């Protein structure tokens, strides 16, 4: 499963652990270890972030 989410805001994490995504950026959800903080993969990069800052596109 693939899960794709669309961010609604840019996220510039300077630190490690947080994924770097932008607005409307289709991120491939890696996991949901945290109901608030979801992990996602942006092409290749992994990272965690408040899913609140996005919206499942999943594409379907």
PDB file of C-alpha atoms in Angstrom:
ATOM      1  CA  UNK A   1       0.000   0.000   0.000  1.00  0.00           C
ATOM      2  CA  UNK A   2       0.696   2.788  -1.084  1.00  0.00           C
ATOM      3  CA  UNK A   3      -0.499   5.896   0.325  1.00  0.00           C
ATOM      4  CA  UNK A   4      -0.143   9.227  -0.982  1.00  0.00           C
ATOM      5  CA  UNK A   5      -0.811  12.432   0.768  1.00  0.00           C
ATOM      6  CA  UNK A   6      -0.862  15.995  -0.336  1.00  0.00           C
ATOM      7  CA  UNK A   7       0.705  18.639   1.824  1.00  0.00           C
ATOM      8  CA  UNK A   8      -0.987  21.977   2.375  1.00  0.00           C
ATOM      9  CA  UNK A   9       2.067  23.716   3.556  1.00  0.00           C
ATOM     10  CA  UNK A  10       5.747  23.866   3.006  1.00  0.00           C
ATOM     11  CA  UNK A  11       7.942  22.127   5.504  1.00  0.00           C
ATOM     12  CA  UNK A  12      11.594  22.874   5.843  1.00  0.00           C
ATOM     13  CA  UNK A  13      12.990  20.609   8.413  1.00  0.00           C
ATOM     14  CA  UNK A  14      16.486  21.524   9.247  1.00  0.00           C
ATOM     15  CA  UNK A  15      16.886  18.537  11.424  1.00  0.00           C
ATOM     16  CA  UNK A  16      16.877  14.863  10.820  1.00  0.00           C
ATOM     17  CA  UNK A  17      13.836  12.723  11.148  1.00  0.00           C
ATOM     18  CA  UNK A  18      11.465  15.134   9.512  1.00  0.00           C
ATOM     19  CA  UNK A  19      10.713  14.765   5.868  1.00  0.00           C
ATOM     20  CA  UNK A  20      11.106  17.755   3.594  1.00  0.00           C
ATOM     21  CA  UNK A  21       7.971  18.456   1.645  1.00  0.00           C
ATOM     22  CA  UNK A  22       6.161  21.344   0.151  1.00  0.00           C
ATOM     23  CA  UNK A  23       2.743  22.470  -0.609  1.00  0.00           C
ATOM     24  CA  UNK A  24       0.513  20.108  -2.458  1.00  0.00           C
ATOM     25  CA  UNK A  25       3.456  17.777  -2.536  1.00  0.00           C
ATOM     26  CA  UNK A  26       2.390  14.165  -3.018  1.00  0.00           C
ATOM     27  CA  UNK A  27       4.196  12.324  -0.294  1.00  0.00           C
ATOM     28  CA  UNK A  28       4.240   8.559  -0.134  1.00  0.00           C
ATOM     29  CA  UNK A  29       3.209   7.707   3.355  1.00  0.00           C
ATOM     30  CA  UNK A  30       5.813   5.422   4.871  1.00  0.00           C
ATOM     31  CA  UNK A  31       3.991   4.770   8.080  1.00  0.00           C
ATOM     32  CA  UNK A  32       1.732   6.155  10.717  1.00  0.00           C
ATOM     33  CA  UNK A  33       3.636   5.442  13.844  1.00  0.00           C
ATOM     34  CA  UNK A  34       2.080   8.551  15.196  1.00  0.00           C
ATOM     35  CA  UNK A  35      -1.565   9.529  14.743  1.00  0.00           C
ATOM     36  CA  UNK A  36      -0.311  13.075  14.331  1.00  0.00           C
ATOM     37  CA  UNK A  37       3.098  12.518  12.874  1.00  0.00           C
ATOM     38  CA  UNK A  38       3.075  10.492   9.719  1.00  0.00           C
ATOM     39  CA  UNK A  39       6.112   9.330   7.877  1.00  0.00           C
ATOM     40  CA  UNK A  40       6.340   9.864   4.179  1.00  0.00           C
ATOM     41  CA  UNK A  41       8.604   9.456   1.266  1.00  0.00           C
ATOM     42  CA  UNK A  42       9.112  12.156  -1.197  1.00  0.00           C
ATOM     43  CA  UNK A  43      10.532  10.439  -4.153  1.00  0.00           C
ATOM     44  CA  UNK A  44      13.256   9.055  -2.118  1.00  0.00           C
ATOM     45  CA  UNK A  45      13.467  10.917   0.966  1.00  0.00           C
ATOM     46  CA  UNK A  46      11.913   9.758   4.051  1.00  0.00           C
ATOM     47  CA  UNK A  47      10.806  11.688   6.989  1.00  0.00           C
ATOM     48  CA  UNK A  48       8.148  12.258   9.569  1.00  0.00           C
ATOM     49  CA  UNK A  49       5.796  15.188   9.868  1.00  0.00           C
ATOM     50  CA  UNK A  50       2.405  16.232  11.225  1.00  0.00           C
ATOM     51  CA  UNK A  51      -0.030  14.707   8.766  1.00  0.00           C
ATOM     52  CA  UNK A  52      -2.180  17.603   9.803  1.00  0.00           C
ATOM     53  CA  UNK A  53      -0.146  19.560   7.395  1.00  0.00           C
ATOM     54  CA  UNK A  54      -1.331  17.444   4.514  1.00  0.00           C
ATOM     55  CA  UNK A  55      -4.252  15.649   3.000  1.00  0.00           C
ATOM     56  CA  UNK A  56      -4.428  12.080   1.667  1.00  0.00           C
ATOM     57  CA  UNK A  57      -4.703  12.308  -2.022  1.00  0.00           C
ATOM     58  CA  UNK A  58      -4.166   8.765  -2.614  1.00  0.00           C
ATOM     59  CA  UNK A  59      -4.688   9.305  -5.553  1.00  0.00           C
ATOM     60  CA  UNK A  60      -6.716   7.041  -5.720  1.00  0.00           C
TER      61      UNK A  60
END
